Structures are given as C-alpha cells and as structure tokens.
Amino acid sequence: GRKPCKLMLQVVKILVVTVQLILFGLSNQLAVTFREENTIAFRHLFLLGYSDGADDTFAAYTREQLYQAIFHAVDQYLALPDVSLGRYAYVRGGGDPWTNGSGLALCQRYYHRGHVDPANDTFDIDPMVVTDCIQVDPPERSSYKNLTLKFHKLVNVTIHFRLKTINLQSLINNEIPDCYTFSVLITFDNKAHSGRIPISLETQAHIQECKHPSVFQHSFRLLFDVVVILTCSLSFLLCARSLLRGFLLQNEFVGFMWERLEFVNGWYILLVTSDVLTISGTIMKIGIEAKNLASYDVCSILLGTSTLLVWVGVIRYLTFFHNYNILIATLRVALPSVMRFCCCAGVIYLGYCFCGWIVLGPYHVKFRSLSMVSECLFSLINGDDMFVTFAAMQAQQGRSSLVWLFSQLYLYSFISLFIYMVLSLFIALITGA
Amino acid sequence: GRKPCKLMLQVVKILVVTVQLILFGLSNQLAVTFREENTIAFRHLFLLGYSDGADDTFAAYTREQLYQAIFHAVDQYLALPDVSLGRYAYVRGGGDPWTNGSGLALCQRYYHRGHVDPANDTFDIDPMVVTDCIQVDPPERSSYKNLTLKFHKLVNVTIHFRLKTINLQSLINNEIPDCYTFSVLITFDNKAHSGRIPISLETQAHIQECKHPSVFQHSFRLLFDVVVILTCSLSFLLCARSLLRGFLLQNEFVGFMWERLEFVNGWYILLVTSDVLTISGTIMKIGIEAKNLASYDVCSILLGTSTLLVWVGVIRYLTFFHNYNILIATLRVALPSVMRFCCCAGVIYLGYCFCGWIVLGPYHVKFRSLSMVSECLFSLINGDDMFVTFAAMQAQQGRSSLVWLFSQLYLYSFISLFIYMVLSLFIALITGA
Amino acid sequence: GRKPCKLMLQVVKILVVTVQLILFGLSNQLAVTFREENTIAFRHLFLLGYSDGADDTFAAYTREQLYQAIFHAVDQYLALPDVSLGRYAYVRGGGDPWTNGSGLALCQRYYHRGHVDPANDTFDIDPMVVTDCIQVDPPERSSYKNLTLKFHKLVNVTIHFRLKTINLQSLINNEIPDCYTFSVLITFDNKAHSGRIPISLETQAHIQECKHPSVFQHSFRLLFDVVVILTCSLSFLLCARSLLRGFLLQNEFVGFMWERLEFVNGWYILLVTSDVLTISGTIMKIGIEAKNLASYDVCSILLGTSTLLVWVGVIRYLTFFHNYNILIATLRVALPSVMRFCCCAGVIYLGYCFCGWIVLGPYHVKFRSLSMVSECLFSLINGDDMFVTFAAMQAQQGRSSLVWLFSQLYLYSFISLFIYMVLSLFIALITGA
Amino acid sequence: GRKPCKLMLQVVKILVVTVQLILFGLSNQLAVTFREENTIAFRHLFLLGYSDGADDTFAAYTREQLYQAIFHAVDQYLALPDVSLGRYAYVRGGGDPWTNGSGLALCQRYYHRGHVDPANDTFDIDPMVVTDCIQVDPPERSSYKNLTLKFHKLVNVTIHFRLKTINLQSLINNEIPDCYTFSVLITFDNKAHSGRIPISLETQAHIQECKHPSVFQHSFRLLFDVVVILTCSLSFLLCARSLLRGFLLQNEFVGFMWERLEFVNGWYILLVTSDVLTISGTIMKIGIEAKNLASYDVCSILLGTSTLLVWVGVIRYLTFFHNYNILIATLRVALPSVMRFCCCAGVIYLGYCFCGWIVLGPYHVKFRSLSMVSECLFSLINGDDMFVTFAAMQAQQGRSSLVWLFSQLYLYSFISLFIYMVLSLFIALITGA
Ligand SMILES: COc1ccccc1N1CCN([C@H]2CCCC[C@@H]2NS(=O)(=O)c2ccccc2)CC1
Ligand SMILES: COc1ccccc1N1CCN([C@H]2CCCC[C@@H]2NS(=O)(=O)c2ccccc2)CC1
Numbered sequence A, B, C, D: 001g002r003k004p005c006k007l008m009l010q011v012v013k014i015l016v017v018t019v020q021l022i023l024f025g026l027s028n029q030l031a032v033t034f035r036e037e038n039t040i041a042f043r044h045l046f047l048l049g050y051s052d053g054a055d056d057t058f059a060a061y062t063r064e065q066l067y068q069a070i071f072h073a074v075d076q077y078l079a080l081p082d083v084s085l086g087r088y089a090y091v092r093g094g095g096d097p098w099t100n101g102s103g104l105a106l107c108q109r110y111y112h113r114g115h116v117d118p119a120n121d122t123f124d125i126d127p128m129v130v131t132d133c134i135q136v137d138p139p140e141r142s143s144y145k146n147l148t149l150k151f152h153k154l155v156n157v158t159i160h161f162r163l164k165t166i167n168l169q170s171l172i173n174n175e176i177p178d179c180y181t182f183s184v185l186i187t188f189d190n191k192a193h194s195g196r197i198p199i200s201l202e203t204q205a206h207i208q209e210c211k212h213p214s215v216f217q218h219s220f221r222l223l224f225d226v227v228v229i230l231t232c233s234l235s236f237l238l239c240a241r242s243l244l245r246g247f248l249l250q251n252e253f254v255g256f257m258w259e260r261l262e263f264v265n266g267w268y269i270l271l272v273t274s275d276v277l278t279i280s281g282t283i284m285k286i287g288i289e290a291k292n293l294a295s296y297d298v299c300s301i302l303l304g305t306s307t308l309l310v311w312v313g314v315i316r317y318l319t320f321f322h323n324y325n326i327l328i329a330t331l332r333v334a335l336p337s338v339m340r341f342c343c344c345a346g347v348i349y350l351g352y353c354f355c356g357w358i359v360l361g362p363y364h365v366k367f368r369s370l371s372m373v374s375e376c377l378f379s380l381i382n383g384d385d386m387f388v389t390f391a392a393m394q395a396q397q398g399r400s401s402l403v404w405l406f407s408q409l410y411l412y413s414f415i416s417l418f419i420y421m422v423l424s425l426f427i428a429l430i431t432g433a
C-alpha cells in the first residue's frame, strides 16, 4: 500500500537538535559565570577605590592618584595568597612580555622625543613609541616603587600578569573540575592627553585539562552529538535526492516548454542549510568539549541559526492544511510591496541618520556613532526612548539654542513623517485588496 | 404573571465577592509591610557596611572582609536589646540547628577531603560535605571569635537565629495586635569558588496568636465570609440545575437529530468555576484569619481568579442588548484566525528565542534565561526596551565584533519580520470581511 | 447690508485668556522654585547625613542614630544664623505647639500604658496617646539634651519650628520682593514598630506682604484681568441670548411637531462653561495676587480647564469648511461604538486589576495600590514598562515559584487578550463602513 | 543617437557629498572629545568633593562649605603644574576681567545698598550691582584668603581663568597637533537667595594654530572640498537651465490656455537648495579647517540638511519605475487629509499643553516648561514614559489630592481621546478609498 511519509525523521530533528542546544547552552552559561565573577573579584582586588557600576567613569586625575593606583595594584598582586580567597596560583611567566622567571610586568609606554611646551606654542614630537618594562617576581613564600612616569611623554601604562585556578563549579554539573588560567591586563590609558586617564582591567581565560584529576565518582554528550550527525547526514542525503529528482524533471520541462526558473521548493534548501550548519556546529562543539579548540562564538552562532532554520520547518508542515495555507499565502503576497516601500523609507532613513549624526553627534549622547544613530532612530520609530532623547537635548538649551531648535524640528519631523508613511503604505494595501 | 429573573442574585455576587477581596487585600498589605520593613532593619542591623539598593552586588572579596562581616553579625546579635529599637526577643532555640539552650548557630560548611593545588594542576576532592557548627547563647541580661574558615575547602557559611516580636500595627486596623517570630538566615555563599562571596539575608515569619492579649476595647469578617459561602452555594445549585435541564433537552435532541456537541452555554460553566474557587478561597481565608494555616499564595490566587471570572459575567449580561451583541459576535468570529496565525508566529518566535538565548546569553544581561529571552522578545514586539537592548549590545563592540554584527542582524530581522507579519495577518482580516 | 459676524470677539478670547494664563504661569513657577529650593536647603541643614535622592529610603535603625539625628536637628536650628547662608529669622512662636516665647518644639508622642513583652507573649496597651513637649528658645544673640525616648512605647517624634525670610527673586521679575514664613516639621515616624524609623522633613509657606518695602523704582496685571472679565462677561451675555432664542424656537417646534431634545448646539454650552470658569479663576487670581487668599490649586485648575475649553472653539470654527467637516463627522459617528466596546473592555480590565492587585500586591512594587495597578495595566496596554514588570517578577522566582508562574500567565494573557480585542473592534469598524 | 542622461552626475553627488560629511564628522568627533574630557578633568580638579553624575545637584549649603570650595578652587589653580597631569600652561591674562599680569580673577558680585531684615519685615534694596575682584597671579616657578563674602547682599561669586594646552590626539588621525586655550569659569550662583547655592564649571575653547609645529612626517581634504564645489556648481547650472526652459514653456502655455501655477517639478528646486547649502557648508568648513573662523554649528547643520535633501533624490529616481510610482502616488494623495486632521488635533493638543503646564507645572518634573510639556505629550501619544508620568504624579498623592485626581482625569482623557482620534481619522481613509 501507500507507505507513510518519512518526514517524521524531521520531527526527530526538531526535538533532537533542540535538546543538544539546550544542553550546550546550560554548560556554556556556567563557564561564562565563572569567567565573569572572577573578573569582578580581580577588579575589587586590583583597582584602588573601585566600586560596582563605576566601570566607564573610573579614571585618575592627579599624578598621586596614578602612582597610588599602580602601587596598590602591584602590592595586591604581591599579597594575593594572604589576602585573597579563591586559591589562585602564580605562573612565573615565560612569555614575551615577561622574562624567564618573572610574574608581573609593569610597562610604561611613551614617545621617544617629546618636547611639549605650551606658553610658547612650540613642540617637536617623534611618534615612535619606546616601552620601558619593570619585571616583578612573585613572592617566594622590589624595585617597582622607584618608578618615574614622564607624564608629558606618556602614552599608557600597562600591568600584565597571569593567575592559574581550578574551576570547582563542575561538581554541581557532575563534570570533572575544569581548569583555568586568567591573563589579566590593567591599562591606564593616556591616549587623549586630556588630563583624565581612564583605568580598566581586562581578562582572557585559557581553559585546559589539568594534569591529575583524582576526583571521586568522576558517555552521554559524546553519543548525543554523533546521533545529531547521523540524523542531519540522513536529511542531507534525502533532501539532495529530492533536489536531484526535481532538477531532472525540470530539465525535461525545459525542452517541453521550449517562474520557470523556480521549480524547486526552497524548503529543501532551508533544510540542507540547517543540516550543514548543525553538522559544522556539532563538530566544533565536539572539539570545544574535548578542549582541543577554544572558540565559543562561531559554534554557538551556527547552532542557533540551525535551530531557528529547523523551527521554520514546522511552518512548512503547517502549510499543508488549507486554513493555515490561506494566511501563509496572504503573507507571501504582501511581502513584495513591503520591500518596495522599504526601499524608499530606507533612503529617507539613511538621509536622516547622516543628518542626525553630523549635527547632534557632539551634543547628544545617543548620536555618537552611525550605528548608534540608526539604533536610536529605529527605536524611535516604534515609540521607545522618545522622551529621554527630548530631555537629553533639553539639557543643552542654554548653549547653542540654534542647535536645540534644529534638534526639535528634526525629531518632530522624523517621527511624524515616518508614522504617516506606514499608514499610507497600508491604506494602499487595503485598496489593492 | 411572568416572574422576574433571579439573575439579580449574580449582581449581588459581583458586589459581595468584590468587597470581600478588597477587605482581604487591605489586611494582607499591612502584614507584608510589617514583614518587609523588619527585614530591611535586619539587613541594616546585621550586614556590615550595607546600604539600600546594594542587594545583588553585596559581596566580600578578602578574608578579612569575610571575618569582619561574620563577627559584626554575631556581635550585633549579641548587642541587639541595647542598640536595636523595636523590642525583639530571643528564642533560646530548641530546633535542629540549635542545641537545647542556644540562640544563634554559626555553621561553616565545607568538603571532607579537599586538596586544591594549582601551579601543579593536581587535585583530589571528595564531594561529601561536612558541617561544623558553633552555638552561641543569647546574652544573660563567647568562643565564636576563635573560628577558622578553611577558605580552600569552603562551600558556604550560614548564620541562623530567630527573633520574636509583637505586631503593633493592628491597632490602626482595630485588630488585636498580631504576633510574629522571624527566622533569620545570613548566607555567605562560596559555591562558585570565584573569589567573590555573595552575602545575603533571608527571613521567614511564623504568625501565631500569642498568649494573653490584654488590649483595651479589643464579628463582621466572620459573618461576611459565610455570606459569601451562602451566595456562592446558591449559584452552584442554580447553575447545576440549568446544566442538568439543558443536558436532558440535549439528550432528547440526540435521538431527534439521529455544533451538536455544544448545547450548553459556557457562561454557566464559568459561573460554576467561579463559585468553586470563591468557596475554596474563602474557606482558606477563614483558616488564615483563624491562624490555623499559613499559606497566603493559594488563597489570594483563588480569590483573584474568582473575582476576574465573576467580572466576565457582566459581559455575559451585556451580550443581551443587540448593539453590544454585534461587537461581541465580531470578536468571537475574529478569534479563530488569530489563533491560527498565532501558531506560526509562535514557532518562529520559539526559534528566535532559542537562537537568542544560545548566542547572546554569555554577553547580554537580558538573555540569561529562556524565560528572560521570551520576556525580552515579547516586550520588543510591542516596542519596549529596544534601545536599551541595542546599547547593551553596543557596550561589547570592542570584543567579538562578529557577535555584535550577528546581534545587530538578529534584532533588526526579528523586529522587522514580526511587525510585518501582524500587518499581513490583518490585511487578510480586512479582505475576508 | 449683511453685517459681519461678531465671532471675532471669541478670536480675542483665545488670545487674551491664553496670554493671562502664560503670565500667571510664569509668576507661579518662580514661587514654587523659591519654595522647593529652600526646602532642599532645610533638609541639608537639618537632616544628619542626608544626601540628594535619599528621600524615601532615609531612616534610622539604632537608638544612637535617632538620638544623634534629633540632637543634630536641634543644634543646627540653634546655630542657624552663624552657619546658614540665606538670612532666615526666628519667629518666637506664639501658636498652639509653642508657648509664649519659644521657637522650637520637640514633641515625643507615645502610648499611655504600654507593656510590650515578647518571650512571654503577653501585652497590655492603652491606645490613648500622651504627648510630651520640650520647648527650646532661639539663641539670644538648653535642656533638650536630657531627653529620654521610651522606644517601646514610642509612636513618633516631631520637631516644629518656623523661619521668616524675604523673597528676593522678584527683582528679576520687577516685582516688589515677596515675603515668606516657612513652617518646618521634621517627623521620625515609628508607627510600624518594625525597627525602621523613617525620617522626613515637610514645609508649609505662608506668603504675606511685609511691612515697609523701601525698594527703588518699585498697573498692567490688574488691568489685564478686568479685561478678561469684560470679554468673558460679554460672551456669557451673547451665548445666553443665543440659548434663549434657540429655546424659544424649540418651544414653538414642540407644538408644531406635536433628536427632538437636541435643538441647541453644545458649542454655546461649552463657551458658557469656559466663561464661567475663566471669571471664577481670574477673580481667584486677583485675590491671590492681592495676597488676601492663598490657594493656588483651584485657580490654576480653573484657568487651565478654561484655556482647553476655549481652544476647542477653534475646532468649532474649523467645522464650517466642508473638508474639515467631513472628518469631524467621521469622528462623531465613530464615537458611540468606541464607547460601547469600552464598556466590555472596562469590565474585563477591572477584573484583571482586582486580580493583579490581590495576587501581585505583596511581591511586585508596581501593584501596591489599585490606582497603581490601573496605571500599570493602562501603560502596559500601550506598550510601556513591560520588561521592567517582567524583570521585577523574575527577581522573585526563587521564592514562591507558583506565584511567578501565575504572574507569567496573567501578564501574557492580559497583553495578548487586550491587543486582540482592539484589532477585532476595528475590523468591525472597517466592515460597518 | 539618443544620448544617455547626464543624471549620473547626481549619482556622483550622493556619493561625493556623503563622503565629505563622513570625513568631517570623524574629525569633529575627535575635537569634541578633547573638549569634553578636559572639562571633566577640570571639574575633578577644581570642584571640592565632586563626583561623576552630580552636576545638577552639586551645591553648597553652609558658609564654611562655600569658603572651602572657593579656597580649594584657587589652591588647585595655584598647584596645577605639580598635581595635574596633562601639561597645562598659564596665560597671564591681559583681558578685561584680568589686569596686566594676573592669571585668575575671583569676583564677588553683590548689591550696592542692601538691608534685608526679617523679624521686622522691613527692607531697602538698590538693584544696582557692585563687583569686587581679587586678582591672583600664577605661581612663579596671596591675599585671596582674606576674602569676606557678604552673604546677605550676595548675588554670585565667579572664578575666571585660562589654560593653554596642546591637542596631541591628532597624531592618531595623522594631523598636525592642534592647539587649544580653555577659558574656565566657575560660578557659585546665589540668585534665588534660597539658602542653596549651586556650583558649576563651564569652559570655552579657542582653537588656534600654534607657532612652531616641528612634528615628524607632518592635500586630500583641500582637494576634496573643491571637488564638491565643482560638482555642486555644475548641478546648479544644469538645474537652473531646466528651470528657465520649463518657465519659458510655461510662459507660452499662459497665452495658450488664456495646477496651472505648478508647471515646474519641485525636484529641481530641492536639488538647487541642496547645492546652495552644500556650497555654503563646504566654504564654511574650508574656513573652519583653516582656523580662520570657529563656528561648528552652522556648518554641520548646513552639511546635514544638504545630505538629507540629496538622499531624497534617490526617491526621485525611484519614482520612474511604475511599481514604486504607484506607492509614491498613494503617499502623495494621502497627505492632504493628514494635514487637515493635524490642524484639529493640533488645536486640541495646544489646549491640553496649556492646561497641563498651568496645572501640573508646580508638582510634576516633566511639566516645567511649555516645550517640555509638548515633548511629554508627544511621547505619551506614541506610548512612551506613561508609567513614569503616572508614578511621578502618584508620589504627591498625600498633598493636594484634588490635584492628583485632576492629573488622573487629565492623563487618562488625553491618552484615550488621542488614540481614538487616530483610528477615526483612518477609518475615514479606508472609506474614501
Ligand atoms: C529592516 O529595515 C530597516 C533596517 C535597519 C534600518 C532601517 C530600516 N528601515 C527600512 C524599513 N522600514 C522598516 C520600518 C519598521 C519595520 C518595517 C520596515 N522593515 S522592512 O525592511 O521593510 C522588512 C519587512 C519584512 C521583512 C523584513 C524586513 C523602515 C526602516
Ligand atoms: C500569547 O502569545 C505568546 C505568548 C508567549 C510568547 C509568545 C507569544 N506569541 C504568539 C502570538 N503572538 C502574539 C503577538 C502579540 C499579541 C498577539 C499574539 N498573541 S495570541 O497567542 O495569538 C492570543 C490572541 C488572543 C487571545 C489570547 C492570545 C506572537 C507572540
């Protein structure tokens, strides 16, 4: 008799792939937490007078402040095993910035020939940048204090070190305790030479299996990903067979007929792309879990795109029924005029973006970059953050009243014009009908 | 002659039930205030260097900080009757965590065999968790200071105690002063082993009538709830009679005819459910006021659902008139296509939710959990918090620019696609008409 | 020939009345500023450890804190002429709270018989409240320190005083320097008996002309308001004449015909109400400027309502032209179905409001009162503060997960149901057409 | 044969002009950063106890606070070369406020005859304002301490000085290091005489080429702007030719025919305006880069308006195709009824604005000025900041409950009325069709 459709295999995919994603997601979350919490601690350990939330406004304004910040950072590094809870370890760095047997590297980076002399208006500068590094060795368990800074020639000051730690959060997830090495860089940046030196701390973790994990009680994830590979490979073969058979029938139709370029359903192309991205992502995740490679951005993006493109196959299966099909056809027929209107709205929107960036960039905090301007305008179209924009512009009414008037006209015209255009677009879409 | 409709009884319900809710609500509000204010005080009494608003970011970062926090908490417990205003009382706890004659319990909870040793990469851990408790007795009106912590093996530190107090706010509401016992637990949590130990304080109140309330001037609430019971029981009987009579007429129609499954109006089912929930909620509230049981979540939920389902009966009574009936029929006929569109929009929305959680979870504060992702997307559809999302993603443009580009594409595509789909859904709903 | 319409008189009104409002508004703004700035200063002068923005969370938590706050307030009152800039004056209060020759009144207010005794669960309280007041005299240019508080019986502590000052901001507005007396009340409120005593400062100003204003260079406002009176009185007479003539014609039509109840245009009723409110408001403003009465709430409300109802007469004059008339008629014919739908939407909205208040009141900050619940739901319908609501509910997912699930269902159902109902209402309004 | 259209020249414009804008924008951004960062530093250098974000609430409340603030500012000016990083230079000011050989000017500004005397209610004031200035000379590398203030007569206190610096950020942009002079004014403002003296710091930069820039490695921008001039001049000539030829044909049509007033396409007028504004802006930018004039507001506004009006020419070129033309014609035919409705909505909106400003101005932070009221109402129409408005009004429910009730009615009526009017406007726009 009539055999049933093997499309149930895809119903497996929507389940199986999704489960994989969830599992991966959970694990990934834990890791990022362990990376973020540590970073917070490092700030509180190494940044003098640091408080939560003061990340972008944290800076030094006097020479004494800079000296105390640097000395506090180095002293807290030297006194880490006594004052810090968390069981960090020194690395005795043998890389490029550190010599063979040094833990911390305080490097002051400044111009070679710099004679800045206001009150006469003369100056000669050689943009070539020299770097002077003082190496400090971890406590056993000295000369960093005698450090001049040359504030007139200063470009930046950087502190580099590393700390090895053991991730004990795995036991909650029944994993074998993971194993980290954090590279910490503290930068006092004087690029602007404006009298304000921002201070920041950044970290980079290098996850690696450590030597002897003698954990008690110490085969499901590894089998799950190969199951994903098998199912996705099966779909690839089946969809490729459909693509070939359809193309053969189209090839005969070419001579027969001798919209014609569209004889293949894009659903199979979507499924093929989903399988390709799921297989690439799952191989990358196999490598990530094995610790042989560390790139969690590409793998997550691939898996998420695969999951989304797989959840559009449910719409594919919904099309079958007439009731859903009518609405889907209405969507499909509405699309082209929407794109056509979007072209003209886009050129007006680009013009407004350029004007807003060039005029309100100096004064408005929300117009600093072109991407920020586009985001602000897009959110303003949908009715978000309108009053905060108006109030941010009102805060500078005392200075450059002409700029304030132009901003008022610009914002009012943009909002009114774009709401009007959407409504007109549709009364056309209710007439054509 | 034609007797008038007894439906006025339901008009009583909408009044009477509502009044009950309001009364209950008012009383409940007072109690929660007395519970929240006390908690705030406890924080300010027991958390060292605590300030309002620093609840999620409150943590300790050095061993000395942890020691001072613990010792300050215990000392403030010991000096409570002298420094604290509010007239709290010790309990001399005789429960499980406290021995017979001890008030406070400082319990340090740590692994049994733990040898964490970075700089060699080896480690052996036994996940079995030992607990060492030091009992402190309330002041009459000692050895807690000699406490090591074992920071390498630490899991958490907990402080348990109780405080009895008298609720004097009742006099405002002309009640007999209520009577509380607060169980306070202060946890320093080192589960992450990340060098940052969050500190928090939680409370649990046990309301109970106390022994001899010799209040001056010391029968309406008790009579009101039984009135609710009578009225709701009456409605149950009347609606059940209607259900039976309709079903008998339907039973004859079955043979006669031998939409057919729908011969009963859902209004009576709604009213029956309302009566059932109001009776259950009012019995539970009787018990709550009598102090025999303490569960204010189920009772409030039941009463609120009953009130809402009772206020839909006003729509029932509005249907009668033709003018309202036409609009109600329009709503009813519009519903099915809305559900049908909601299915496809839902599968696209689930796909987008999974993709956003898996990709932007590590970096974006609004994508930490699947429920949070769904809430963010739902609020983004309606035009809320769009620019804060864009700015939170812009804050991490320097690192992983590929992630930033993907986030831009993802957000723009989601917003544009979903606004487009609503409009297309309706131009279908203006054609079908 | 055909005389032109005297309706130009109303065109005068829209101008003249508006101008009056603007003038009044400007003056009023100055006064409120002088009242608010002073208040801020008083806080910074009299509240110990007070900082801007800490108004609702400012409280005392220990007996020593309360004692220091009270003593600091009294000492700062005693040392005002030496430490405070602003030239305030003592009043030597001769009112009720102050005796003849006392400036400040520190009044502790506590029960008469109060024996609160936890750890035995007994208590006797006499709700009668005694008050003990200590009077302090202004410095010439003593025994307040010996003050017990009786924290177990305490209800509140209040500090009352007054300060006379001269408003010098008038010179900017070319007025004669106005002249204030601020009554300051500082309350430490212990009504909750929860261990947290909120501290707040409130003021009340009594503007009065002072004795001898020998200002240099020292007739337009007074003439302007009588011009408003004349014009508004003229409109009243003219509109009343129209009302009478129309009613006479209607009276004959009654017998002739023997919508019939509507033979008078509501525009004249609107204008009559506008004139009545403008005359009342301008008389009240005459009195306010003369300083004979001090109530700036009624007068401002009357003037604003008059201005709005006068700016609707411009729509009246727009109706004349056919193009505007067609749109206005469309609005008028659309109104009744909107009201009819609003009834049913309102009963569903009231039901949801009651349910949300009763369930999420204890846990959610936005559901504390019924008015707050209604405001939150109304703003949620229009797409505002959705994600902050969801996040505030997410913050309490750990405790009472059933409440969190109910909140999720409640919010999602409310938003989806109400957006659906608006769209259905209109597809009816596009069919009927 | 048929020559191709020279309209490709305009396709050049859209490119070339845009590029210019971007280049200008980038440069401008750098300058404003160098101006803002320095200002921040100056605050942190000269304002005693200043912290980021405390700009509007920063004020002094006691005489000692004012004295310490003034003395700290002057001392930090005197100790700038030793404590400040950034290499600023003294100017030895020879302007009006400074004498020949003085760097800083501390000027106290107060009335001539002022006898403010509360507790008797008398006062005589002479509005003539005397000014007493103390000149301080920069450190070599004294009597400012003996300064009385006359707080009863005080109007304000001002500190004026200048600082020369070298902009070293150019090297990043491969420019020749720019060269600044900042005029700093610190004002302690006592205009209100309310006991609260706001303290603020403002700066004004004067960019000028300095004397001898002996930079190493030291013709594209200058050539680019003249290219813009050539292209825009070409368009002016071509569009003027089209305008003349069209007008000649219209002139003959006048006699022939003897909408008739519209025989010229507004696209050429738009292009002519774009060319005029681009040429003016590019000449102004030439002058700005040459440092001969310093006005970055007019030039940026001109360039942005030119860019926007040039990006509307892409819509001009889109009109050609029929598919886009149909939608554009729908927009054009929809416009007039939108304007006609906007008139009536505007008069209702003006009425509501006046009422809201006059009533809620004293109490609501969002209704301080008419422009602020209009912005708040416009954002409220689109569904933004609704709940913050409601909560700000709820915060003052205890005082003037009548005002709170009026605010509730006003806000609800405004929102409901205006949403209703948009929908009615369109059901008219779906009928007319
Ligand atoms: C992506 O659009 C943009 C993206 C980035 C910046 C500006 C825009 N624009 C151009 C388009 N307009 C949008 C207005 C609000 C939403 C509708 C329009 N999106 S869409 O392109 O037509 C569309 C339709 C269907 C599916 C996918 C996309 C106006 C702003
Ligand atoms: C509940 O919906 C959701 C719930 C949770 C997450 C996602 C969705 N979805 C799916 C549905 N879509 C909604 C878009 C905005 C509002 C209209 C749609 N709600 S509804 O289900 O059709 C509906 C209609 C009538 C009565 C009750 C419900 C799109 C997001």
Ligand SMILES: COc1ccccc1N1CCN([C@H]2CCCC[C@@H]2NS(=O)(=O)c2ccccc2)CC1
Pocket: C338, C339, C341, C342, C345, C346, C349, C374, C378, C381, D412, D413, D415, D416, D417, D419, D420
């Ligand atoms: C005032 O309405 C309310 C007021 C307070 C609480 C709840 C509501 N409701 C009931 C009405 N609904 C409103 C939904 C959004 C706006 C349209 C509806 N306003 S309106 O009454 O019909 C109307 C129409 C024309 C003129 C004046 C009023 C739904 C919430």
Ligand SMILES: COc1ccccc1N1CCN([C@H]2CCCC[C@@H]2NS(=O)(=O)c2ccccc2)CC1
Pocket: A412, A413, A415, A416, A417, A419, A420, D338, D339, D341, D342, D345, D346, D349, D374, D378, D381
């Ligand atoms: C600019 O409008 C205003 C400006 C400032 C204050 C108030 C308004 N108003 C009057 C107009 N209404 C607006 C409501 C929301 C948006 C539509 C209406 N803008 S528009 O003028 O008709 C229009 C249409 C097409 C192109 C350019 C403008 C209502 C508030």
